[PDB]
Design a protein around this motif. Structure first.
Motif, mmCIF file in Angstrom:
data_model
loop_
_atom_site.group_PDB
_atom_site.id
_atom_site.type_symbol
_atom_site.label_atom_id
_atom_site.label_comp_id
_atom_site.label_asym_id
_atom_site.label_seq_id
_atom_site.Cartn_x
_atom_site.Cartn_y
_atom_site.Cartn_z
ATOM 1 N N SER A 31 -12.486 0.248 3.503
ATOM 2 C CA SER A 31 -11.066 0.487 3.727
ATOM 3 C C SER A 31 -10.808 1.332 4.969
ATOM 4 C CB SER A 31 -10.433 1.154 2.504
ATOM 5 O OG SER A 31 -10.522 0.322 1.362
ATOM 6 N N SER A 52 -4.185 0.860 3.186
ATOM 7 C CA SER A 52 -2.953 0.636 2.440
ATOM 8 C C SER A 52 -2.098 1.877 2.220
ATOM 9 C CB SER A 52 -3.274 0.008 1.076
ATOM 10 O OG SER A 52 -4.124 0.853 0.326
ATOM 11 N N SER A 63 3.808 -1.998 4.788
ATOM 12 C CA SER A 63 2.778 -1.956 3.763
ATOM 13 C C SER A 63 1.521 -2.620 4.298
ATOM 14 C CB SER A 63 3.234 -2.644 2.470
ATOM 15 O OG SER A 63 3.343 -4.051 2.637
ATOM 16 N N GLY A 64 0.381 -2.181 3.781
ATOM 17 C CA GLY A 64 -0.896 -2.738 4.173
ATOM 18 C C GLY A 64 -1.697 -3.146 2.956
ATOM 19 N N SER A 65 -2.595 -4.103 3.166
ATOM 20 C CA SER A 65 -3.437 -4.601 2.090
ATOM 21 C C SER A 65 -4.756 -5.077 2.674
ATOM 22 C CB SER A 65 -2.757 -5.740 1.323
ATOM 23 O OG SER A 65 -2.644 -6.888 2.149
#
Length: 242
Positions: A31, A52, A63-65
Motif C-alpha cells: 500500500s 486509500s 478516494s483511493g483504492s
C-alpha cells in the motif's frame, strides 16, 4: 527501479463528472502508494497516502483504492477547482518513482485560481527555498531549504524536480538525523543532500550539471510512515544551458 504507469495520460471531463485515474506498478508495492495534485506553476499537494487514506483537508469526493500493483484514484464529482494534473508515487523501494501524471482538462467551468500554500508564506509549516539560477553545463549550484514550524530533526526530507512541461521526478531523500541518504540513479556521484539540524536547513549541492538537470526543484517534508510528502516548497528554477 519500480516503474509506475498511469492511464490515461490526459483526460477531458465536465463539472460533476466521475473521474477515475489508474496507476500500475511493475511489481507489488503493498500500500506504499500516494497521490498528488499539481496545478501549473504550483507546488504539488498531497491527496491520498497509504493507497486509500485521505489527507487531512482534502474533500471526500477524492478516494483511493487498490493494493499490490494496481491502484485507482477516484473523484466522485469533479469540481471547478479539481482541474489539474494528478500523480501517483510509490514509497515502497528507492529510488522512489512517480507516475507520468494524468492531466484532467476542461471540456463551462471556473475556479478561483489559487496554488496550495508553500514556502514561508503558507501556514503551520514553512519551507523557504533559495539558490536557483542559471549555470552552464559542467557547473555547480547549491539549493537551500530553511524550515520552521515543526521539529526539523524528526522528519525525513526530499528533493523533487520537474523539468519544464514534464512530470515530477524524485531526486534525493535524507533521514531526520541525516544518517541515511538516497539518490535517483541519474544524480549519483554528482549531487549531495545534507542537512544542518542546528540551523534547521536542508541542502542540495549539485556539480557536473547537465542540460537534462534543468527543472524546478522542490524541497518536501515527509510525514507518517508511508512515505507521503505533506508540505512542499514553492520551487526554485535551475537552468543549465550554454
Amino acid at each position: 527501479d519500480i516503474q509506475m504507469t498511469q492511464s490515461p495520460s490526459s483526460l477531458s471531463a465536465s463539472v460533476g463528472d466521475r473521474v477515475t485515474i489508474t496507476c500500475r506498478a511493475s511489481q507489488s508495492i503493498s500500500s506504499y502508494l500516494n497521490w498528488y495534485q499539481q496545478k501549473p506553476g504550483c507546488a504539488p499537494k498531497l491527496l491520498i497516502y497509504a493507497a486509500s487514506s485521505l489527507q487531512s483537508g482534502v474533500p471526500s469526493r477524492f478516494s483511493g483504492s487498490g493494493s499490490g500493483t494496481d491502484f485507482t484514484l477516484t473523484i466522485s464529482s469533479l469540481q471547478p477547482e479539481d482541474f489539474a494534473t494528478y500523480y501517483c508515487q510509490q514509497s515502497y523501494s528507492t529510488p522512489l518513482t512517480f507516475g507520468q501524471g494524468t492531466k484532467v482538462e476542461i471540456k463551462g467551468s471556473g475556479g478561483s485560481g489559487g496554488c496550495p500554500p508553500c514556502g514561508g508564506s503558507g501556514g503551520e509549516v514553512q519551507l523557504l527555498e533559495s539558490g536557483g539560477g542559471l549555470v552552464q553545463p559542467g557547473g555547480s549550484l547549491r539549493l537551500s531549504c530553511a524550515a520552521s514550524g515543526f521539529t526539523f530533526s524528526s522528519y525525513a526530507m526530499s528533493w523533487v524536480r520537474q523539468a519544464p512541461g514534464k512530470g515530477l521526478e524524485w531526486v534525493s531523500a535524507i533521514s531526520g538525523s541525516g544518517g541515511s541518504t538516497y539518490y535517483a540513479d541519474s544524480v549519483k556521484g554528482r549531487f549531495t543532500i545534507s542537512r544542518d539540524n542546528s540551523k534547521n536547513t536542508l541542502y542540495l549541492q549539485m556539480n557536473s550539471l547537465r542540460a537534462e538537470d534543468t527543472a524546478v526543484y522542490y524541497c518536501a517534508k515527509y510525514d507518517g510512515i508511508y512515505g507521503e510528502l505533506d508540505f512542499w516548497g514553492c520551487g526554485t528554477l535551475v537552468t543549465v544551458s550554454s
